[PDB]
Ligand code: HEM
Ligand code: HEM
Ligand SMILES: CNCc1ccc(-c2cncc(CCc3cc(C)cc(N)n3)c2)cc1
Ligand SMILES: CNCc1ccc(-c2cncc(CCc3cc(C)cc(N)n3)c2)cc1
Ligand SMILES: C[C@H](O)[C@H](O)[C@H]1CNc2nc(N)[nH]c(=O)c2N1
Ligand SMILES: C[C@H](O)[C@H](O)[C@H]1CNc2nc(N)[nH]c(=O)c2N1
């Protein structure tokens with residue numbers, strides 16, 4: 001019941017007591033571990049609200065106080081009456097920051113308390129959504145000095161009036177299936193790109209076309225908007241030693257901004273809550289550029305390096321992988337756009353874990369996602385035991401809109 | 408119940424039914440996952456059903472389930488348990504059990520080879536000297552002059568837990584570690600404590616950076632005894648780099664034969680506390696973990712120095728760059744000396760084929776993603792994108808406590 005986690009590189013042992021406050025389920029049982037699986041009413045609402053308000057008032061050292069009991073009272077009344085309730089600005093900011101704090105798959109959580117929360121609950125139309133999102137993008141980008149931010153749109157009511165951003169990320173590149181049979185641009189976005197076209201987009205059918213926003217307000221049919229190009233900061237990718245690297249024509253966007261998740265706070269559901277931080281290098285260089293189901297450029301780069309691609313045991317893939325990731329970091333740094341390498345980011349996370357164990361009694365963590373997709377065991381997180389569990393407030397996955405939307 | 412796993416690179420979906428045959432616990436609950444945790448005297452009472460379950464599995468596999476031979480054997484084992492409080496496996500059952508323990512090892516990426524295992528029955532062994540002989544023969548057989556062959560040697564099963572056979576070495580072949588007065592370490596830092604035990608037991612340490620440790624062998628619950636493996640039986644490989652001529656001057660070598668000797672083999676409820684087994688290396692075990700872990704030989708610095716990489720900013724990825732060259736050298740060196748080794752690309756590709764095969768013919772393949780994905784270049788290998796279910800089947804290999812913590816010394 002009081003669990004220990006060991007670091008096998010440093011022999012340091014931490015005791016987790018925070019997991020006892022876990023509410024949601026893991027997918028695992030005593031018979032089977034699903035640790036590597038990607039996706040494993042009035043009555044219900046009040047205890048959820050209560051649990052949240054309890055931890056909120058605890059956090060501001062006013063547990064069991066007049067203000068605490070009064071607020072509990074007021075929300076209890078509002079639920080009984082309106083079948084839902086509205087968060088105070090203070091509770092919203094707290095809940096959003098803690099949703100990030102609780103994101104067990106996020107390596108960047110040392111920054112959790114420095115989140116800019118944009119309250120967009122007064123939004124009523126897709127054009128308003130577009131305005132709010134442009135402002136978010138401009139604020140977060142900050143001319144390359146990236147700042148964490150989240151924009152929170154109205155909460156779900158009867159499920160028939162959902163606000164949704166249909167894009168998976170605010171900024172991503174289009175994908176087109178070729179008559180050649182191959183794929184132009186980002187293969188991961190072919191389906192979404194078609195929906196844009198099926199909704200009326202005018203695709204420039206290029207390799208790095210920034211997708212339009214598909215925004216859905218109040219359960220209405222979604223609408224298309226183009227983000228002002230001058231708000232999308234991009235970085236041309238070059239290598240500090242290989243001059244030929246630029247001729248690959250590679251670039252990527254500066255702002256990683258997830259827009260398809262659901263923010264749960266005190267039982268309330270925010271179906272549209274785009275949030276953003278800044279990249280860890282490997283997200284671009286390892287996953288985006290080198291996955292076989294993505295831009296898959298390993299072979300092209302290896303060839304330019306004149307490596308022996310006869311035998312896998314020459315580790316040509318590995319050698320090119322490193323150089324690509326060198327170039328990404330180099331390119332971002334040179335253009336003064338915030339980025340963190342996997343060594344720095346994972347070192348930060350260990351320090352954050354130790355902070356969380358000390359001041360909170362634990363830190364939920366998903367090793368499968370926290371360990372970088374290259375060079376894993378030379379980062380300190382590899383040797384760090386982690387316990388994974390689900391605390392609320394939380395970011396949750398939700399069904400893709402097109403599979404749900406009643407047109 | 409049915410369980411699906413998805414490969415996110417290929418969209419291949421597989422259905423697991425084998426997990427229904429799972430008995431042991433995982434450590435996880437509905438409220439916590441312990442998937443990244445390293446480590447999460449038996450009465451006749453609990454022994455009959457474990458024996459029965461195993462023999463049902465055995466006779467099913469040979470297509471003789473429910474036969475008179477099956478029924479006679481159950482009867483025979485039953486009587487033997489209630490008479491003697493234990494029982495003995497037939498040779499056929501032992502071989503089956505050992506192969507299936509490997510087949511079931513959810514942390515092992517090399518399992519495509521599970522059916523080709525050489526099983527050495529040492530259940531007639533009675534002394535440490537006899538253990539030494541059996542282990543020498545295993546090492547010679549497995550090594551096969553560099554053409555490695557998988558093998559396992561099985562010493563007598565536990566009885567009352569007061570007469571255990573144990574190999575005190577974690578692996579049959581390993582280098583000594585010496586903690587210096589100034590706090591530095593000579594040799595392999597992982598083996599400092601075991602080295603000290605050996606020294607206390609009378610081992611004369613050469614005190615070099617690559618001294619092969621003596622065997623410390625315990626038979627029938629007696630105090631362990633020291634034995635030196637004949638050097639001519641210990642195949643080693645000098646590490647050099649195909650393009651970097653200064654790499655040889657680092658003075659590195661490694662042994663060819665990975666042989667785990669501290670685990671417990673469970674078969675039909677019986678416990679084999681000494682069951683050394685060996686295969687061949689995947690490159691990264693040596694080049695990533697053995698050489699580059701901060702808690703091991705830790706040579707990233709010197710290699711990066713000699714490469715003249717920019718070492719002031721970690722964002723130069725000088726650590727990653729050095730790591731790759733070292734792993735190139737390890738593979739190159741083994742291949743050049745014709746000692747069996749497999750790169751992490753080949754090994755993970757084979758495991759996926761194995762896994763898919765197992766789903767089709769067996770209804771599953773328990774696998775621990777945390778261990779299966781290699782310690783470098785994870786997502787450019789096919790296993791990274793593969794969803795896996797982890798559960799525990801028997802026969803199995805299990806961890807057991809270090810013997811120096813539990814042994815009652817005779818004197
Ligand atoms: C500011 C610097 C940040 C860094 C360096 C960072 C880093 C990462 C990385 C590398 C991942 C793995 C995701 C993948 O590989 O696809 C991740 C996941 C995640 N991050 Fe963070 N992140 C940052 C900011 C944030 C912020 C501001 C939030 C929320 C307010 C957040 C919430 C999450 C969540 C919920 C996941 C899981 C995503 C999923 O399941 O798809 N992150 N992060
Ligand atoms: C024949 C080629 C083999 C290869 C390439 C291979 C590969 C590996 C690797 C890379 C690991 C992880 C090692 C680590 O990082 O500590 C491992 C673990 C393991 N292997 Fe295999 N192995 C092979 C043979 C065998 C054999 C013959 C057996 C048993 C008969 C076996 C049983 C296991 C077990 C039980 C583990 C888990 C170790 C632990 O929990 O500490 N393997 N294997
Ligand atoms: C085959 N899979 C392709 C694919 C899968 C998942 C994703 C993805 C989708 N949504 C979110 C992410 C998380 C990335 C992220 C988010 C944030 C806030 C910061 C950061 N550094 N990185 C990743 C992209 C592409
Ligand atoms: C971190 N302390 C050093 C260390 C600790 C444990 C191990 C280790 C422990 N148990 C099992 C292993 C398996 C290694 C292996 C075994 C076999 C049969 C084949 C193979 N290729 N590799 C390795 C190695 C090194
Ligand atoms: C804490 C964590 O589970 C530990 O470092 C694991 C990670 N994955 C591993 N994978 C392999 N093959 N071998 C290991 O020793 C480890 N160590
Ligand atoms: C199947 C496996 O869980 C899947 O490939 C995971 C592994 N680890 C990951 N880790 C991160 N950070 N992001 C991912 O998308 C994944 N994918």
Ligand SMILES: [Zn+2]
Nearest residue numbers: 028033435440
């Ligand atoms: Zn689990």
